[PDB]
Amino acid sequence: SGSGEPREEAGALGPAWDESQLRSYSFPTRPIPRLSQSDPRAEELIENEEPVVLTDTNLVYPALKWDLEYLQENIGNGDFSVYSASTHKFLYYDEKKMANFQNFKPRSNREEMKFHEFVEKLQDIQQRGGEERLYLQQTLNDTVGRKIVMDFLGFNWNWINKQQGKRGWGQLTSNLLLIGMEGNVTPAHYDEQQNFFAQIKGYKRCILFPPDQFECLYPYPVHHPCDRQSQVDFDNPDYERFPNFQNVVGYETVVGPGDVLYIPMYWWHHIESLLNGGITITVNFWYKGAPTPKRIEYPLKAHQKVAIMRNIEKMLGEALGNPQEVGPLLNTMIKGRYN
Ligand SMILES: O=C(O)CNC(=O)c1c(O)n(OCC2CC2)c2ccccc2c1=O
Numbered sequence: 001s002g003s004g005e006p007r008e009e010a011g012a013l014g015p016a017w018d019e020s021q022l023r024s025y026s027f028p029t030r031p032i033p034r035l036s037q038s039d040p041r042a043e044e045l046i047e048n049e050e051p052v053v054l055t056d057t058n059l060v061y062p063a064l065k066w067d068l069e070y071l072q073e074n075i076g077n078g079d080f081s082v083y084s085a086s087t088h089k090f091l092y093y094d095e096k097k098m099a100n101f102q103n104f105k106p107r108s109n110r111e112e113m114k115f116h117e118f119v120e121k122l123q124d125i126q127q128r129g130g131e132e133r134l135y136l137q138q139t140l141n142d143t144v145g146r147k148i149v150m151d152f153l154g155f156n157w158n159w160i161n162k163q164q165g166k167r168g169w170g171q172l173t174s175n176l177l178l179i180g181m182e183g184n185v186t187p188a189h190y191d192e193q194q195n196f197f198a199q200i201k202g203y204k205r206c207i208l209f210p211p212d213q214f215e216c217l218y219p220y221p222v223h224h225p226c227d228r229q230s231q232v233d234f235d236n237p238d239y240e241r242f243p244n245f246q247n248v249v250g251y252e253t254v255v256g257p258g259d260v261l262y263i264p265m266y267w268w269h270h271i272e273s274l275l276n277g278g279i280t281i282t283v284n285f286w287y288k289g290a291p292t293p294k295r296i297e298y299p300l301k302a303h304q305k306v307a308i309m310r311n312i313e314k315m316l317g318e319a320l321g322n323p324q325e326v327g328p329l330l331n332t333m334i335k336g337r338y339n
Pocket residue numbers: 092137178185186191204269271272282286
């Protein structure tokens with residue numbers, strides 16, 4: 001039990017969720033702390049780059065009223081990236097890297113459309129009873145209607161801007177809106193930026209793994225379109241190819257409306273929209289991490305070693321003139337020499 005006992009909602013409305021809405025996996029977890037932003041422990045966790053769920057930021061307070069109808073009326077007439085998938089797992093592909101690996105075609109199609117088309121496409125699926133799932137993921141721009149601009153202005157910019165200043169982070173790079181169907185799964189991956197994951201509607205089970213568990217999670221090659229994702233099928237883990245997955249230990253939480261999960265830079269995260277929980281809405285805030293310090297302190301952090309491993313794969317990819325020779329060169333380098 002990583003998320004703990006399901007939290008009770010105000011007004012004696014009882015269980016927000018129950019454990020049968022969670023998917024079953026083979027690894028143990030422990031709870032990410034649920035704290036208040038006023039708690040000095042929450043401050044220590046963020047500076048030390050450990051995950052924390054803040055319960056009372058009011059970061060996206062004006063957005064707590066968002067649903068499909070309100071958004072459809074006010075978000076405007078931009079294009080929204082909608083990812084499709086025949087299964088519940090939404091594996092993403094770097095379309096630019098799809099050239100290096102000709103021997104693969106994607107399984108989660110992206111399709112640009114207008115917001116009203118996505119809403120029509122969604123309740124079509126619920127009435128046809130079909131198995132197809134959709135996931136709208138669109139960076140917020142200024143092509144957005146007046147009432148949503150007002151809501152944006154209503155975010156707690158005082159709090160998050162001071163968090164950016166106190167941690168030495170870079171600038172805010174994007175505000176990703178995510179709207180998803182129940183049961184949708186974003187499979188385990190890590191990002192290179194600091195993330196405040198602000199939950200708006202519905203419930204999302206977030207399972208995180210620290211950077212020192214690189215060896216248990218087996219990311220794709222840097223040049224692979226699925227760069228930064230685990231190769232391990234959490235529903236059917238191949239212990240023969242991925243034996244250290246038997247040693248993986250996660251940090252787990254379930255975020256609901258009003259909650260803000262800090263996902264530290266380089267922390268693995270597996271996110272799922274709770275089964276039979278309806279649609280989920282999230283806004284993400286991405287900050288570039290703080291610049292690498294003056295004097296390098298040893299021993300290195302785990303995330304610096306990941307960054308080192310990424311640079312070696314990149315450097316080899318361009319030195320050899322072909323990303324596909326990285327593998328054989330690296331094996332030639334270690335076989336009988338370092339293993
Ligand atoms: O689904 C959830 O609740 C959590 N989603 C994520 O964590 C998530 C992510 O971090 N990235 O990388 C973006 C970084 C480059 C700026 C993606 C990229 C392409 C397509 C999908 C995603 C994605 O879903």
